[PDB]
Design a protein around this ligand. Sequence first.
Ligand SMILES: [Cl-]
Ligand SMILES: [Zn+2]
Lengths: 597, 173
Amino acid sequence: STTEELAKTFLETFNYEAQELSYQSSVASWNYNTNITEENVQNMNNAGDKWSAFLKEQSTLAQTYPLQEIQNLTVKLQLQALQQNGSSVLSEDKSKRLNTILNTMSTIYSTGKVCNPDNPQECLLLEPGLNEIMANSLDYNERLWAWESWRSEVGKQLRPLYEEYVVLKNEMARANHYEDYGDYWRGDYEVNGVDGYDYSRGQLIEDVEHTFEEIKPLYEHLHAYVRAKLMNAYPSYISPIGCLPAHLLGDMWGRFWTNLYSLTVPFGQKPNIDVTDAMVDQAWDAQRIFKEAEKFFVSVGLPNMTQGFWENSMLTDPGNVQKAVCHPTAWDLGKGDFRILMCTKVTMDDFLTAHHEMGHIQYDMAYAAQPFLLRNGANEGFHEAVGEIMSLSAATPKHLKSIGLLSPDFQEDNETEINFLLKQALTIVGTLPFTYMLEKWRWMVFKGEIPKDQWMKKWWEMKREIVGVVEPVPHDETYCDPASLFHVSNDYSFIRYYTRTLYQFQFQEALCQAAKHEGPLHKCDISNSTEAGQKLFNMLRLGKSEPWTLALENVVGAKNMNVRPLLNYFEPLFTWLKDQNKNSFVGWSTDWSPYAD
Amino acid sequence: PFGEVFNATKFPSVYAWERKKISNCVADYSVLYNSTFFSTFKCYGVSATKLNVYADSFVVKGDDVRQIAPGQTGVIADYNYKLPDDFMGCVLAWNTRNIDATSTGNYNYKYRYLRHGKLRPFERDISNVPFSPDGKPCTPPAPNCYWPLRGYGFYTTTGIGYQPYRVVVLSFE
Ligand SMILES: [Cl-]
Ligand SMILES: [Zn+2]
């Protein structure tokens, strides 16, 4: 009856009870998202609420145990988790208010709809409407309008709240011995005692700012290329040495340059790594899609989906007489009860998606052995990276012919490739900086390094440095754009999107050299290779069990996030660009502006 | 005579398992030889006939079936049912999701997970006194107080590993 021995027996009780409440919570949450009625929705809460109850109870109960008295390190790790000291350390007044804030921001962002200044009787929501505009509109003004309309109505409104939002949130952090709400988030990456596998809540910032450096060349160059391309799209509205106008980047914030493919495509005279037709032309149905993906993973020495998986899962839109949420989703309801929700539609996008999702399911199972509190990805990124690993292999024309969705006779030429390759930069390499500057800004704002009256004059002072992008109208502290984006005005660790990006590649490399790959890194298809599968299943079955660094090791074979393998995926490209930019200017002046004066 | 344990309407909960004694009787074993129905038959003794007994029945989780066999640390064999390291006969099981599992959960089947000491072969424990890892008599919701018995709660929709399987341990002497 030591201090450990007592905790030992605590967790044991927590595990068996959490398994039942959590299962009850998911099943309800499941019946809703797949039947949306009144009885099913009301229910979702009761169950969800009970599970919410059990937590605070069990959290402010794990206090009985002073962490520093643990030898079986695991216990400390678990105990640590239950130590979600929530937002209790505050005052019932503040905690109340805090949640009142979050909630508003959330509903403002969800409800906020702007109305046509040139047709007050008509209005639009972010999605669709506004977003519909930011992706397809070629009207410099219409784009300009929506961009400002949004950051002008809801933006401003969120300014007050965010201001208070910070303080309170910061207060919390400090109490728990964290430098700020910032050093809080960074926590997710921390490691304590294990030798050569530790990691500080600060080295993230180092290893991020370090890695990001090696990416600059590739970025500057992609930037420079799309720039001139845009210069043609929006004649005269751009500077050949200046930055890029925020309302012109494929979506409402410039998150991803994806939608710019339209007018940046290297060779318009190329066509289909789109089997969408081939699928419909072969009468493939839902089942085929998922059944086929099951094969893929088997092909690398992993298991068939559970007998239950097929019995419970929802693979096709129920139609009417039963309304349901169609976000494709992986489900790990626990009790060895896995399943996917997808309103499947015989297309390629969906076909890859189905693989991506079955990747999550694959990860989930792998770590089912681990104790209830360790059943997750090494970190926030790991789980998404694992899924995108699959999307990567299945997308190869190689794998597509391999399966009979692409006429065996089709031969890939190095131009259709540059395409795809850049259609990638647009998404993978466009959001990289956008992400680094974002979190860095919140990051700084949380170490106080950025005053309330320079909150935009600091935003865009780095948007013009890190991202080489400009504001089409200047903003004052009336506006609060760094929050105009879901992830921010709804409180979320946004750095995941960065780290998950590298991780997914060192994983893709690790698996190609292991599965013996001869062509350029993006031609890889781990498919049919079991030996490289084994290499995956090591970092997989760990769950949160080890330090992500060890987890990373197991596959890649290193102990840190190296960007060199991303650069590798984008090397046939990287040069093709230095070539287009022989006459273009590579870089940008932080001073140039679209509005002028 | 066996038709009363197998085929039986209701089954006992592990910790409180039921032992049947069949004296002066004969059965072919062929009602058992065939019918794949069973998901387990490991017979730690033989597999023939000689018209010559013990038959304990109860219900455990799926993956918990692994534990009804000699050796095997437990948590089920440590605290609910322990088969002798040596002396043996047979262990039998079948899936009963529809009989013992509901769509809302059926927490009627229990198992002990907290105990002081391990169960010596064939032993049984129906105690139900608040547990504490030192002996201090408990009184919930006091700290470090747990009721040693818990429900399984078999939902019709859970993994085969977490589905209700009934067990009959036929022991010969
Ligand atoms: Cl912005
Ligand atoms: Zn995903």
